[PDB]
Every structure is written in C-alpha cells, then in structure tokens.
Amino acid sequence: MVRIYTLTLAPSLDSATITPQIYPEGKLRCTAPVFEPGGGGINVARAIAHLGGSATAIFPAGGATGEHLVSLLADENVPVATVEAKDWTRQNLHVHVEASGEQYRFVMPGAALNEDEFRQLEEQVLEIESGAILVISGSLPPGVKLEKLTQLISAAQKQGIRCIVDSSGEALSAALAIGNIELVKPNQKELSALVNRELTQPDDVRKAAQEIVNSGKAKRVVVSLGPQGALGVDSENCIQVVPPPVKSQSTVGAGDSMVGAMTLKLAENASLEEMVRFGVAAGSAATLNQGTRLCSHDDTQKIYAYLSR
Amino acid sequence: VRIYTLTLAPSLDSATITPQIYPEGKLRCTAPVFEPGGGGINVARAIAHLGGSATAIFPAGGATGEHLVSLLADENVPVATVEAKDWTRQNLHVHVEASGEQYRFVMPGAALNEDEFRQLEEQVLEIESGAILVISGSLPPGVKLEKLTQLISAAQKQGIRCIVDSSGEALSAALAIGNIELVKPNQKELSALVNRELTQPDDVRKAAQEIVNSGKAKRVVVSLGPQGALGVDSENCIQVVPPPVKSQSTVGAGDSMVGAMTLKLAENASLEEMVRFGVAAGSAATLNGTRLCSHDDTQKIYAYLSR
Amino acid sequence: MVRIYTLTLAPSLDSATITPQIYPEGKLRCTAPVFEPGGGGINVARAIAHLGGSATAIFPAGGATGEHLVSLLADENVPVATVEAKDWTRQNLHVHVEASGEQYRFVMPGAALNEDEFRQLEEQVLEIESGAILVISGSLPPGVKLEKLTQLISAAQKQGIRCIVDSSGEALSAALAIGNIELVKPNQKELSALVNRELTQPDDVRKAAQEIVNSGKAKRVVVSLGPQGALGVDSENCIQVVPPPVKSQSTVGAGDSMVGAMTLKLAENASLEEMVRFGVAAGSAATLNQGTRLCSHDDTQKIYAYLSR
Amino acid sequence: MVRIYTLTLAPSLDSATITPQIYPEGKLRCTAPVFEPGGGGINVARAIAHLGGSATAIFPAGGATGEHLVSLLADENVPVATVEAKDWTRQNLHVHVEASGEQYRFVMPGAALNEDEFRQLEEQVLEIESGAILVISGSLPPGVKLEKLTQLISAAQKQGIRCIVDSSGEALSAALAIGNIELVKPNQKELSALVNRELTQPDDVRKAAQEIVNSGKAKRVVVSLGPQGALGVDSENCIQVVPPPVKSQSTVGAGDSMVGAMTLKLAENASLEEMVRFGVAAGSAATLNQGTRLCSHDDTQKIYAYLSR
Numbered sequence A, C, D: 001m002v003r004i005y006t007l008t009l010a011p012s013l014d015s016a017t018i019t020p021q022i023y024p025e026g027k028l029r030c031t032a033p034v035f036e037p038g039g040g041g042i043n044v045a046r047a048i049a050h051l052g053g054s055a056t057a058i059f060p061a062g063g064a065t066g067e068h069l070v071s072l073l074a075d076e077n078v079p080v081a082t083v084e085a086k087d088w089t090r091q092n093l094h095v096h097v098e099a100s101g102e103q104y105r106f107v108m109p110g111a112a113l114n115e116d117e118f119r120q121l122e123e124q125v126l127e128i129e130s131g132a133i134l135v136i137s138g139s140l141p142p143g144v145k146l147e148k149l150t151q152l153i154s155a156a157q158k159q160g161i162r163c164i165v166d167s168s169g170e171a172l173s174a175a176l177a178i179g180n181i182e183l184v185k186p187n188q189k190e191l192s193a194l195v196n197r198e199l200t201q202p203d204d205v206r207k208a209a210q211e212i213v214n215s216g217k218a219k220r221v222v223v224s225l226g227p228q229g230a231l232g233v234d235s236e237n238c239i240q241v242v243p244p245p246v247k248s249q250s251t252v253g254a255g256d257s258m259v260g261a262m263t264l265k266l267a268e269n270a271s272l273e274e275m276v277r278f279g280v281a282a283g284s285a286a287t288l289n290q291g292t293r294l295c296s297h298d299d300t301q302k303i304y305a306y307l308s309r
Numbered sequence B: 001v002r003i004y005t006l007t008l009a010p011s012l013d014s015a016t017i018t019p020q021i022y023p024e025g026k027l028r029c030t031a032p033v034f035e036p037g038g039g040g041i042n043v044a045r046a047i048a049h050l051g052g053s054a055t056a057i058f059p060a061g062g063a064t065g066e067h068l069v070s071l072l073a074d075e076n077v078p079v080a081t082v083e084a085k086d087w088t089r090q091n092l093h094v095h096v097e098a099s100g101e102q103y104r105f106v107m108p109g110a111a112l113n114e115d116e117f118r119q120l121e122e123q124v125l126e127i128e129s130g131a132i133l134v135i136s137g138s139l140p141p142g143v144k145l146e147k148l149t150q151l152i153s154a155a156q157k158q159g160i161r162c163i164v165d166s167s168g169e170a171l172s173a174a175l176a177i178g179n180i181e182l183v184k185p186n187q188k189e190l191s192a193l194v195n196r197e198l199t200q201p202d203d204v205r206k207a208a209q210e211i212v213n214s215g216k217a218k219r220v221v222v223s224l225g226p227q228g229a230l231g232v233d234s235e236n237c238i239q240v241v242p243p244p245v246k247s248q249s250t251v252g253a254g255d256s257m258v259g260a261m262t263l264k265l266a267e268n269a270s271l272e273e274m275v276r277f278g279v280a281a282g283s284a285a286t287l288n289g290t291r292l293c294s295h296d297d298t299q300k301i302y303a304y305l306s307r
C-alpha cells in the first residue's frame, strides 16, 4: 500500500452543542460545546484512520482555533503536516435540537490564505514521494486564485503523485481542467453544475460521468447518490451500488467517509467494483451514527461483507 | 382477470403553490387545482394510465363528490359509486417555492353510515371469482375494523384475490386472515408489523420473507422510497432501484406502484417483472401534485431498469 | 348615527383545522374543519355587531360554499345583502399546530366576478341612502379592473355616500387617487408603498400620513402600528395611541376589528381622539383572543375605558 | 458626576453571521463572522461609551476569547478592570436569516468561576468609592451561588456604592430582597415572576411596578416593553414612553443600551421623565442594526429629541 496524504485548504474547528428547541429572537440556551476536527481532506484522513488505515493531513492552522484543531488531531492519532497561517482557523457550529431531534449546521468560510501560506502548502505537497496518493477535499478559502490550485495539482502529477479530488463549483471545474485525476466523487448536484446541464433522464448521470472519463479529465468518476448509493465508471466498466435498506440516522460525514474508504482501496490496487462497494459501505455506515460521527470499522465491514456476497 | 379497487375514504385532492411558508402571516396561494384522490382511487387511475382497466368502488357525497366523479369520468375510470350523506373530504397540498417542498393537510375521510357501508359491501361481493380486489387508503369514521376483515374473509370465500394497502391496524388484521395476494408495507410499516427495529442490512428481507413463509401473504413488496422496492415471494427475491432523478410530489407514488404491480399480477407476470414495473411506475409518479404515473414515463423508466 | 354598510368584493369561507405537527412531505393528519365567515368587509361588519352597532355586509356568494358563508353570518345575526355569482366562493384554510402553538393561514384568490354580477353589486351600493357610511375592505378578485372599483367609489360619493377604505397595493392607491375618502387605515407597510418611499426617520410616518390629508386624498388617515397602536391625523390634529401592556395571543383580526370600531365612532360623529382610541381598543382586544376571533365588546370597553381615563 | 462601573459575571464574545435560509440537515453557508464584546454589564458600559459618558467594565476573562473581548473593548474606548479566569470566555453565535429577516441566538453557558476568581471580582468591586454607581447585569455563571452575589451587593451598599440590577429569576428576586436598589429594569415576563401573578389587566404592569417601589425594594422600576417602549415609576411620578415607528432589526443589547442611557441620566441627577425617554431612545437606537452594535450617539440623540417634543 502506498502512502496517503490529504489536503485541506479550508480547514475547520467544528463545535457541537445541544439545545431544547429552536425559534428566532429568543436566547436559545445551549450546552457546553464539544470540539472536533473538520474539513474535507481532514475528515477523509480521520475516516481512513477509523478503517485501520493511515493518512497524513496537510492544512493551514491559524491562531488559537488552529492550535486546538491540531491538538484534537494529535489525540486522534492522525498524522499532520501544517503551515502557520495568519488568519485564524474558522469555527463552525453544529446544533442538536432536542424537541425535534433535528440538527442545524452553520458553516463559515475557510480562513483566508495569503500567497505565502499557499506557497508553503504547495511545498509540503511537493515533498510527497512519487507513487503516493493525495486527496484534495473541501471548499476553497478566500485569497486563493483558481489558477493556483490548478498549478499545484499539475505540479504534483508532474512528479508522480496520484491525485483524488472532492470539491464543488468553480474549484472542482478547475481541478479537472488539468486532467489525469485518478478519481473524483461529485454528488448529483456537483455533477450537474460541472457539466452545466440538468440531469432529468434516467441515463443522464451515467452519460455525464462517462463524458468526464472519455475526455481524460479523470480516470474514475464515482457519482455519489445519497440514499441511492453510487454509480462508478472508468474507461471500460460501470458499477452501481445501493446501500442496505436500513434507516439513516444522520447523513453528516457520509461524503468524506466514502472518499476515505475509496482512497484506501485505490491505495491497495482494488478493482472498480470493490472500490465503489467499500465506498458505499463507509458512507452508509456513517449515517447509522447520530450527529457528526464518521464511519466506524465494524459497521463499514459489516455493510461491505453484505454488498460483496 | 378483472381488477377492482376499494377506497373507503376517498378525497378530492387540491393542489396550490405559495412563495414561502411561515406562521402568523397570510400565505398567498395560487388558484387550486383539483384532482381525484384516495388510495384505491389512485390505484385505479394508475392502472388506467398504464393501459389497463380497473373499476374503482367508493362512496361519494355532496358537490365535492360530484366533482370527484366528474374528474374520474374525464379520465375514463370505471366507477362504482355509493351516494353518501357526509360530503367527500377535501385535502390541501401546498407547494412551497423557496424550498421545493410540499406540505400535506389531510382531513378525516367522510363519515360512513351502516347503510352506506352495506351498499359498498354488496358491490364488493358482486365481484366474480378469480378477479382481483385492491383495498387501499385509510379507514373513515363509522367503519369498524372487524367489518373490513369480515369483508376480506367473505371475498376470499368466493374466490376474490385480495390486495391490501391500508392503515397499520388494517394491515395486521388482513394478514391474520391470511392468503393476502400482495401487501406493500414501507420500512416503518414493516417494523411496526413485526414489532422490532430493522437495524441489520438483511433485516428487511428477513421480515418480508417471514411474512410469506407464514402464509399470511403470497407476495411482500417492501417499499423503500428513494431506494425503490424489495420484493419477495415463496421462491425469489429482488430489489429494484430507481434512476437518479429528482422527485417532486410523491403523493400516490405508492398507489401507482400498487396499480402497476396489480396490473402485472393480473397478467400473471414474474416477481422480477412485477417489482421492476412497480418501481418504474412509482418513480414516474414522482415526476410532477396528484398526477400519478403516465404511460410514457413509466415505459421509459421501465425500459431503463429492464436493461 | 347613520346606517352602516360594508363591501367585500372577495368574500371567503374560512375553514380552521388542528394538526399536532408540521413538516413537509408527510401526511399531516388534521381534524374536521370548523367554519366561519371571511373577507375584510365581512369581518368589519362582524366586529361592528360585537361592539353594539349594526352593519349590513354586501358581497357576492356563489355555490354551496357561498350558501355556507351566508348561513354562518345569519347564525351570528349579521345582516347581509348578497348577489348570486356563478363562480363558487373561495375557501381559505387556517391551521393550528399543537406542538408549537403556531398558526398558518393559507389564503386563496377571491372568486371571479362577471359583468352582470358586478353590475348587481354596484346597484346594491347605489341603493344606500345619502349620509350613510360604506366600508370597502379586502382584496380584489380577478376580473375586476381598478377602473371599475374607482368608478364605483366615485358614483357612491356623488350621492353623498361616505366612503371608508381598507386595502393594499394598486387598489388602495387608486382609491386615494379619487380623493375625498372619509378614512383610510394603512399599516406601516401599506403607507410606505402608497407614498412610494422608505419611512426611516422618527417623524416620517406622521409626515406621509399628513401628506395624504393635505393633498385631499382622504380627510382622515389612521396609520396602524401593530403593538405600537396607531397615529391618526386630520386637517387640524394629530393623535397617537398606544395599547396597554397586556400580552397578545393572536394578532389576526386586529386590522378588521380596528376599522370596525373606527367606523362605529365615525357614525356617532366622534372626535378624532375618540375614534383612534376606540380603534386601538378594538384592534388590541382582538389580539387577546386565540386564533381568528375578533374583538369582543367587554374587552374593547375595558381597554377603551383605560385609554379614556 | 459620580463614576460609573458595571459588573458582568458571565461575559461573552459575541459572533454574528448571515445565511440565506434556515433548514435542518444540510450545510448552511454562512458569511465570515463579525466579533464584538457581549454580556450584560459589558454592553451597558459600551452603550455608555457610545453616548459620550464613561463607565468601567469589571469582568472575568479567560483564554483567547477573553483576550479578544478585552482587545475589542479597547477599540471602543471602554475602560476595563479584568480578572484572569481559568475557564475560557464563552462565545455565542447570532445568525441572521436573509429570507425571513429573523435572527437565531445560540447561547453557550457562562464560563466557570472558582472561589478565588470570584474573590478577585469582589475585591475589585469593593474598591469602588462611596457615592459611585455600580450596574450588575447579565446571567449568573454556573458554579456561582446566589448568596455570594447577594453578599456582594449588601457589602457594596454598606460602603455607599449605589447599585443598579438588571437580571432575571432568582437573582433579581434575591437582589430586590436586599432592597434599596437604585434601579431595576425587568421586562414584562420578569416583572410577572417578581410579583408572582399574571398581569392580565391594562393597569397591572403599572401597579406591579409601583408595589415594588413602595415596598422600598427599588427606588425606581422601569418595565421595558419591547416595541411599546417602557413604563417607569418612582415614589412620585409615572410615565410610559413609546418609540417612533422605525424598523427594528437585531434586539441584542437593546435592554443593556437602555440601562446604560438611564444610568447616565441617573448620574446627571436627571428627572424620571428624561431618564425613561433617554432609555427608550437608546434601546430603540440599539435595534436599528444587526449584531451587537448597540446604540450610536447620533441615532440616540435624534430619537431622544423627537420623543422630547
């Protein structure tokens, strides 16, 4: 198995709290917050750790919030490679409402990155050995030119680094502008915006995913479909995997759990079939847990065994 | 064989649109659009749309009742109506533009006298041996559960093949009678039926099969919404999953699935064919208020799933 | 006192139901609907009868829903003068959610009126004696052009019918364009649209209201200010009245109750001060009741006595 | 003019953000948060500084959030007297929703205060000279017994310090029990619990406020009435002041700004009528903007002049 790295240009220090009910204007009394690491690439790294793997997380850490994010990851035994940033690491809030059992997720933008901090992140990335995997996951923070992300990807590929991409909107289209991306996981909306057309016909999602592969932007496209599982295509095969009929408790963490699992499989030279199935197992395993908990090893394995009969 | 359906609690469905939803203020709504509604009625509508013929049996009361009959007449749906004193209920479906979501305000079904129920019970027993009867929708005020189950038992004794898609208690009671041709519980209904949480990947299959192996029903199709359906009989097991297409209104989606599945059951099709056609029609019925599944959309989704 | 009449071009059969929860997509099981009369002019007439006066409600009624509306008014002993119409009277839905105590008001468009049916309504209005009061209140049904509403008001004023107007938007604006209205009650939002400018400075509401008076558009302008009561102006005087510090249960009906009370006082040749105080008394009394219930006599009198000390 | 101090046992670093709509489950995209000092007595001191007076804020401060609080207060030229606490200053999140215009307020528990940290706060308070004014405002931190805050008030009064209390529930009751409070500003619910009965009649709020004054518990009672302004009484006079009809936005710190303006007038030995007017002006000025910006000098002055006509 090759070494695995993740990149998070917009990291997060997530906080979670509980309150009896939700209504405007009044003071909603919340419990003492519980802190957790957050961010696309970061959670991929955490998910991979839960599955018995190892992934080093590269990200900017700013201020006291940045320190805490670093500290929590250290407790979680997740290796980290950081860059001191000036703009303090953002802090998001997750609210559980007792009366309804519903959750509310307020997501602030990532802290800004200057040219300096972005340069150092690129230097960290280009220290990765040839043949290793790099997962770039999450939103693009302010202060980062769309051209810079593209140049970083082009540079990594240039020295034999294998790139996996999970983003949205403009940054996603930028990452695929280069091409030769080993794997991307768009959801249905993300795929829709990418090819800039509504996917109304039954075979539209597959045709859109195949077009991406056929044009050489990505070797593998796994379109994640929420409760419907996923549809994966490369230059030869197509696989569709549906989760087991078990009720979802909380969809939070599903997308990153699926990316982490599929990353591990790519690392072990897995077939497309095993990659997607293990991807759906982890993503669905994450939804069995309340709140923000990512996939656990046992739930994932249990679902994977079921899908792989 | 011939198909009939039975709706004890019909509804004149009304659909409207509003910009957004919030309390206290006046929420301006558009001019409502009226459509036929109610479980067995929608089933019969679906079957007509799919090229088959099913006679819908139900009570109609007042001007809402006439409105409902007039709409079904325009859809060439054979009706066997019983005149009732209490007016046919009127349900309101509000589509919110800022969310794309739908809110469903569902009034109680119209009351049913002993005499009116008697007339319906006489219509049902005028069904010949070999035909199929689809009992669908909730139980209206004035109707004893035991009166429904005696109706099933009586129907059974004269060769009427019964399909039941109703309330929680009606589902349980119909299964106690046993030999039900087809039931379509969703996940919550299956769980409430067998009195346990379905937590393992295979729990839904195990509970559905358990129902078939115990003789309570011949076929169990567990409806999964977005994930399609999982069907079992005494021999085979199949899950069919819908295409990745966004849903609008899902009202009557279960009913369309039941209609399509009944249709294939009436053609003596295979379990795999029945479930596939079921999910095809069920999802086609989510592409628009209470319009249900069209012939073209169902055929297209079907041809897709059947690849 | 003189005779009092109201005009509701868009009447309503209001149905009220109760449901335990509110959420999308599900079947929200609702109780069998209770019915009551709806429409602006109709509610003005109902509030007047509660306050000891007597007002005849003029409106179209169509089909079984129309008859249902007429029957409900008779059960409350409010006199009516109806015109039969082909298009059935609309039906609105009021939903009270038990889990939260919130209420939701789904308002359908008014029923259509053809030429002959509107010509009958106009005939009814023009049979009102000179010196008598007519309150025009509520929205405009489709099919009725503003030019027709203004021609109706103009004709009425020609034979000395004293017109009071409560509307919004183009309807209110066109009515004031005719001029010589005895009284208008815009709320803050409705005043702003009239003058076509944001009212942001402390004295803006008073200035805008006075403008309407000085221009001749209306002899009296009472701007209702929700919990803050009201500010009324005529050619000579300005008065502001705040409701007493008692909690409101439900503010629906407050508008029509106020207009009801101020109409009664105008009919009794009351001073501006008495009229505004009574209007706030009735409007605020309505808020003491749950749901859609209008002002009661005893509550109004209690508040009015307090204000008039 | 005597010196003014405030005491905030449970300070807050307020954060304010903006999101288009509010719904469960999904990631809600929010704008970058804006930070400002929060907590009852802290907002009182800030409002005073905005209005051209000077008040010294006494409070505990902990961690990086405590440092952020202090720094933000220097920017606003509010003099402070802080005690270092081990538990970090809390951080509350206020979320404004665009499509509704409403605000959601998630309020974390106040930071812990041990015996030694509270002792430091008390020693800082008892350094205040005789004749000076102390404002005690805001919730009680978990781990602080009422008897401690109560003993602090009595000790304070023994050495001539003039105490003003703005609290709720047991704290306000306990404070009033000691008696001789210069001023209290309960809202309507707060007042009802003090006198332990429902305020259902028009004159109930006034009677209730007068009973407290007459008993000698407080020398002045000002019942704040939200949009309806405030009703103030002392041993001789009584006045209700209603604000101008201006659009209100965020209400956070409205009560504190009111308490601040009234504390100034009490220090200038002003009359009841000036005091209540200035308070309504400040409180209403504090509602024109989003977040916790409080009242500005020019807005308060322009409103105050209007009210004094």
Ligand SMILES: Nc1ncnc2c1ncn2[C@@H]1O[C@H](COP(=O)(O)OP(=O)(O)OP(=O)(O)O)[C@@H](O)[C@H]1O
Binding pocket: A186, A187, A224, A225, A226, A227, A228, A229, A230, A243, A247, A248, A251, A252, A253, A254, A255, A256, A258, A279, A280, A281, A282, A283, A284, A287
């Ligand atoms: N409601 C659900 N029920 C069962 N499995 C689910 C559900 N939602 C998501 N999953 C599983 O998790 C995987 C990923 O979810 P999804 O398609 O929503 O990705 P995503 O939109 O990128 O997630 P995220 O918003 O966290 O980034 C799905 O393919 C599926 O396997």
Ligand SMILES: Nc1ncnc2c1ncn2[C@@H]1O[C@H](COP(=O)(O)OP(=O)(O)OP(=O)(O)O)[C@@H](O)[C@H]1O
Binding pocket: B020, B022, B023, B024, B025, B026, C187, C189, D099, D100, D101
């Ligand atoms: N977009 C919205 N989201 C949430 N609440 C709203 C919204 N618009 C209005 N409201 C609510 O409406 C109530 C009062 O204002 P509103 O204009 O709705 O009352 P109204 O009497 O029905 O209006 P009007 O009298 O002008 O017809 C308030 O509770 C306010 O919160």
Ligand SMILES: Nc1ncnc2c1ncn2[C@@H]1O[C@H](COP(=O)(O)OP(=O)(O)OP(=O)(O)O)[C@@H](O)[C@H]1O
Binding pocket: C186, C187, C224, C225, C226, C227, C228, C229, C230, C243, C248, C251, C252, C253, C254, C255, C256, C258, C279, C280, C281, C282, C283, C284, C287
């Ligand atoms: N929250 C309240 N508390 C006390 N009194 C109120 C309240 N809201 C309204 N009122 C009383 O009702 C009167 C009219 O209400 P409002 O200013 O909202 O008019 P309106 O918006 O046209 O009413 P409506 O929306 O019902 O048509 C007010 O002047 C006041 O007397």
Ligand SMILES: Nc1ncnc2c1ncn2[C@@H]1O[C@H](COP(=O)(O)OP(=O)(O)OP(=O)(O)O)[C@@H](O)[C@H]1O
Binding pocket: A187, A189, A190, B098, B099, B100, D021, D023, D024, D025, D026, D027
């Ligand atoms: N305009 C809206 N009104 C109400 N709910 C909405 C709206 N938009 C999104 N939602 C909610 O979002 C949920 C779906 O997931 P959604 O895509 O919105 O979040 P997400 O998974 O964080 O997005 P993404 O994965 O693309 O980052 C729906 O269940 C729905 O409740």
Ligand SMILES: Nc1ncnc2c1ncn2[C@@H]1O[C@H](COP(=O)(O)OP(=O)(O)O)[C@@H](O)[C@H]1O
Binding pocket: B184, B185, B186, B223, B224, B225, B226, B227, B228, B229, B242, B246, B247, B250, B253, B254, B257, B278, B279, B280, B281, B282, B283, B286
């Ligand atoms: N959100 C959806 N997306 C796609 N297909 C759907 C959706 N909801 C329902 N369907 C189709 O309709 C069928 C019945 O829907 P379901 O919600 O299970 O019925 P019920 O009303 O009994 O819960 C499903 O099996 C599926 O084929």
Ligand SMILES: Nc1ncnc2c1ncn2[C@@H]1O[C@H](COP(=O)(O)OP(=O)(O)O)[C@@H](O)[C@H]1O
Binding pocket: D186, D187, D224, D225, D226, D227, D228, D229, D230, D243, D248, D251, D254, D255, D258, D279, D280, D281, D282, D283, D284, D287
């Ligand atoms: N909606 C509003 N409109 C105008 N002024 C307001 C509004 N809400 C508050 N204020 C001003 O702020 C002061 C205090 O507000 P209030 O809600 O009574 O405080 P509290 O938060 O203690 O309940 C009020 O007396 C008033 O001057």
Ligand SMILES: O=P(O)(O)OC[C@H]1O[C@](O)(COP(=O)(O)O)[C@@H](O)[C@@H]1O
Binding pocket: B009, B011, B013, B036, B037, B038, B039, B042, B091, B106, B109, B136, B137, B138, B250, B251, B252, B253, B254, B255, B290, C027
């Ligand atoms: O039969 P119920 O449970 O009383 O509800 C009646 C409603 O259900 C329908 O029959 C069908 O909708 P569903 O597919 O959600 O069950 C509507 O047409 C009708 O308004």
Ligand SMILES: O=P(O)(O)OC[C@H]1O[C@](O)(COP(=O)(O)O)[C@@H](O)[C@@H]1O
Binding pocket: A027, D010, D012, D014, D037, D038, D039, D040, D043, D092, D107, D110, D138, D139, D251, D252, D253, D254, D255, D256, D292
């Ligand atoms: O002191 P509490 O009751 O814990 O509340 C603290 C919050 O209240 C504020 O002091 C504002 O006061 P109000 O909402 O009572 O006007 C905020 O600054 C702070 O976030």
Ligand SMILES: O=P(O)(O)OC[C@H]1O[C@](O)(CO)[C@@H](O)[C@@H]1O
Binding pocket: A010, A012, A014, A037, A038, A039, A040, A043, A092, A107, A108, A109, A110, A137, A138, A139, A253, A256
């Ligand atoms: O990187 P984005 O898209 O801004 O999302 C950040 C949020 O998403 C998460 O990674 C979970 O989806 C959280 O850790 C974090 O709060």
Ligand SMILES: O=P(O)(O)OC[C@H]1O[C@](O)(CO)[C@@H](O)[C@@H]1O
Binding pocket: B026, C010, C012, C014, C037, C038, C039, C040, C043, C092, C107, C108, C110, C138, C139, C252, C253, C255, C256
């Ligand atoms: O806003 P519209 O179209 O005039 O409808 C009137 C509605 O408002 C009410 O007057 C409530 O004040 C009801 O009588 C009626 O349901």
Ligand SMILES: [Mg+2]
Binding pocket: A166, A187, A255, A256
């Ligand atoms: Mg994702």
Ligand SMILES: [Mg+2]
Binding pocket: B254
């Ligand atoms: Mg169903």
Ligand SMILES: [Mg+2]
Binding pocket: C187, C255, C256
């Ligand atoms: Mg009004």
Ligand SMILES: [Mg+2]
Binding pocket: D187, D255
């Ligand atoms: Mg307060």
